Amino acid sequence: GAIKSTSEGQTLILTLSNPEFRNALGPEIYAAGIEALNAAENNPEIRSVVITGEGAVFCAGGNLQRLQANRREAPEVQAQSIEGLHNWIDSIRTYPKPVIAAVEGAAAGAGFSLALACDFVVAASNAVFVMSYSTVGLSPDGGGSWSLARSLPRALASELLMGGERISAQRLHDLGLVNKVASAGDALSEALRMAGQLNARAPNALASIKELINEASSNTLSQQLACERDHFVRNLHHSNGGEGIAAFLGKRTPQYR
Amino acid sequence: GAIKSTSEGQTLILTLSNPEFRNALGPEIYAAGIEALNAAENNPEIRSVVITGEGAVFCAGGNLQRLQANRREAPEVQAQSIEGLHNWIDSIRTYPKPVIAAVEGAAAGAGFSLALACDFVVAASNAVFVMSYSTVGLSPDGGGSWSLARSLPRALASELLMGGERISAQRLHDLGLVNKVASAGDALSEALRMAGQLNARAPNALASIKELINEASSNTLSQQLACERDHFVRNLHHSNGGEGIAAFLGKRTPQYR
Amino acid sequence: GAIKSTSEGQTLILTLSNPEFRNALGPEIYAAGIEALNAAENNPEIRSVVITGEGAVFCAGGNLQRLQANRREAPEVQAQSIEGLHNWIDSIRTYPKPVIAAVEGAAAGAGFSLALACDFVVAASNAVFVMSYSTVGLSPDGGGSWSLARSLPRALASELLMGGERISAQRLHDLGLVNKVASAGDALSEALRMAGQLNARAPNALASIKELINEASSNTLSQQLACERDHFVRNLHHSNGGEGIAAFLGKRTPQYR
DSSP states (O other), rough: EEEEEEHHHHHHHHEEEOGTTTTOOOOOHHHHEEEEEHHHHTTOOOOEEEEETTOOOOBBBBHHHHHHHHHTTTTHHHHHHHHHHHHHHHHHHSSSOEEEEEOOOOEETHHHHHHHSSSSEEEEEEEHHOOOOOGGOOOOOTHHHHHHHHSSSHHHHHHHTTOOEEEEEEHHHOOOOSEEEETTTTTHHHHHHHHHHTTTSHHHHHHHHHHHHHHHHTOOOHHHHHHHHHHHHHHHHHHHHHHHHHHHHTSOOOOOO | EEEEEEETTTTOOOOOOOOGGGTTTTTHHHHHHHHHHHHTOOOOOOOOEEEEEOOOOOOOBOOOHHHHHTTSHHHHHHHHHHHHHEEEEEEHHHHHEEEEEEEOOEEEEEHHHHHHSSSSEEETTTTTOOOOOOGTTTOTTTTTTHHHHHSHHHHHHHHHHTTOEEEEEHHHHTSSSSSEOOOOTTTHHEEEEEEEEHSSOOOHHHHHHHHHHHHHTSHHHHHHHHHHHHHHHHHHHHHHHHHHHHHHTTTSOOOOO | OOEEEETTTTTEEEEEOOOOGGOOBBBHHHHHHHHHHHHHHHHHHHHEEEESTTTTSBOOOHHHHHHHHHTSSHHHHHHHHHHHHHHHHHHHHOOOSEEEEEEEEETTTTHHHHHHHSSEEEEETOEEEOGGGGGGGGOOTHHHHHHHHHSHHHHHHHHTTTOOOOEEHHHHHHHHSSSSSTTTHHHHHHHHHHHHHHHHHHHHHHHHHHHHHHHHHHOHHHHHHHHHHHHHHHHHHHHHHHHHHHHHHTTTTOOOO
């Protein structure tokens, strides 16, 4: 399997491609995705990232034949395959630019976990989100247990994770796990629209905001208020802070670096 | 008061019985409920638990006459009564099998707390969920403050806990605190349906999943990703992992131990 | 700018007044608001607090001209302005009485953060809630990043904080961030209604409840169960505990001190 990188304006598009296995994740997808993030990281022609599946599907999870094979191997082989995924996930989560998932058809198992790791999600109204791990005797990975257990109450998180129950794009939207529910086939275009609006915001302010959102889950309010203070003062004194305020006061469009 | 244990297939049914006091909780209910969990824990004929109230009511809370009496006693008497409840709650929360609440009529005070401690809830559409403690000059117990404060935002958690305001089964369902809203009188049957679908899943994978959901509230993502990795590798190498994958690839029904 | 204090029955009303700047927050509003809380704190004629904006607006955030000026000053000037706000916010959050926000028109930037710091919110159906910081090149303050990151899932919290996207009173209500959506111009009256119902509850029990809700975000369940036990026993033995139970058993209205 592979990741294909393209660009439209200031947004990197990463396309998961494994047509025979419905864009299944695997050790080479993890390394190419880490690489594509690393290449774009300090490149100012890129201000946001969209992750999307080639064709009619986002990602159906891992490849069940490869898992069945790693079962003949020592445990460390699978542990190592998971560390690659988990590095991908961490790298998305700490990326200093917004990452957006654009989901057509299925986002299943680690596909769903991947979509949950991004900052935003756009899903076709007929997208199928499911933690399929349970259904084949497994527990989740890609941080799917964390993302759902911490975002949702017990009952529903249990249904999704233990039950392996499908949930709709519309219902995810109503809970706040999906941003925008698009027409079948329009998820990528809608994601590029949303990414364009983010591309117009100040890069340092977005980086700061994402960092705050990350730290909130482990800070008390008091600790967060101190972090917020330091970020705020810094961003105000940054040139973008001056451009942002002056542009609003002048009724013009801010031009950020 | 008492708990009555019965079985239907692979699900234990615990029926709270205190007809004169609308299935009020109390020190003997706590001990019989701990016992019934302990007896079923390593018994493989039981793969899930349903907790339900006898008759038209789930549980209206504690018994107000007993509380009024313990007020004549040293504080330690009530503290000891609470430790029994709190052990019940902990024991549900750490039970390695899914526990499901089936709520007809009222789930009030510690009844509501109890329903929140379970992994799943099924509620009749005319069920009355309420943190009644406030209304009689008290603060909550059974973990109701935790379950609501961590699952809901400030405003609503405050309304429920400070206001003592009733909330509907439908509204709980919309927030993700209730799984299924059933017709009046059908809550138990619906819970047994849901429990049957869980009974078909792999016991070790469900145990692992519940453990992950528990640990998520106190882990960072990084810590959770490591836990997820260890559970995943273990469950893959488990015989159930092989049966689960092989059954799916073969389009047959997995048979788990 | 200023805060105007008035009373109706047992509820203090704090009115944010800065008509030229749409009730913008600033160092003198922070000190007068801290003072008004301190004065009312051990005064039993006050049992709840409503915070509201003078006129058709709640609070549009900070004053952009003052920020633009503090940009000429050393960083410490703005850091000090933020510490005043952050003390206000902390003081609301730890106040032993319920604080309710009554939002007409805009609650923007630190206005939205302020509304999120209160225990309850009542919003006119045409109220505009927005984290505007992003839009002028800034990151948030007043605990807005914490309040949203911990109450909502990633996608939606990102949209609100990074996107600077407006969200409706109705949608906040559906998520549990707003308690009551009122007719335009009725937000304050509805807040006083809700505050009246809180005024009838036992002060010590409400104080305890708010303290529990605060501590839940940093406790495990086990730690919370111990806190709940101690609060419960204390509140039962309190005279209000006896009045609360006796009043309910007697079908009369409890009279609390």
